[PDB]
Amino acid sequence: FILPSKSLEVAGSFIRFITVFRIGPGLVDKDNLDTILIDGDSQWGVSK
Amino acid sequence: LEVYIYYNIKSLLVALAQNNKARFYSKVKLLGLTVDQSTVVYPS
Numbered sequence: 001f002i003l004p005s006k007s008l009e010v011a012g013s014f015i016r017f018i019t020v021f022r023i024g025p026g027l028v029d030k031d032n033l034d035t036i037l038i039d040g041d042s043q044w045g046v047s048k
Numbered sequence: 049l050e051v052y053i054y055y056n057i058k059s060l061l062v063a064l065a066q067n068n069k070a071r072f073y074s075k076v077k078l079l080g081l082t083v084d085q086s087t088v089v090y091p092s
Contacts (some may be wrong), residue, residue, distance in 0.1 A: 026051070030070060041074050041087075045092060 020046045063091055 001020065006013040023036065027030035028029040030036065035039070067088040076085045 036072070038072060041076075043072065 019046055020044060060091060063089070 001018040003016040003018065007014060014022065018034075021044070023045050025044045028045065032048070033045045035044050036045045038044070071086050073084050073089055074087055075082055077083075078085075
């Protein structure tokens, strides 16, 4: 999810996004996750 | 050989114990009743 932000054409601008992924092996950091939404047997960790 | 086996055991045990930080409650059917279990890799 890509939130609105100032464009990167102008210096000193940041683009803001949220990643929502099914929990699994790989690059996942449960402590730094915003929350871990849960489904039946399947998780979906959303990042800050 | 003993040091190699110790190193493998230490890595395996730490990896197995690390899986207990991601324990979440689900719903599964044991026998004939749907109960709230607590689930959590298992490297060879």
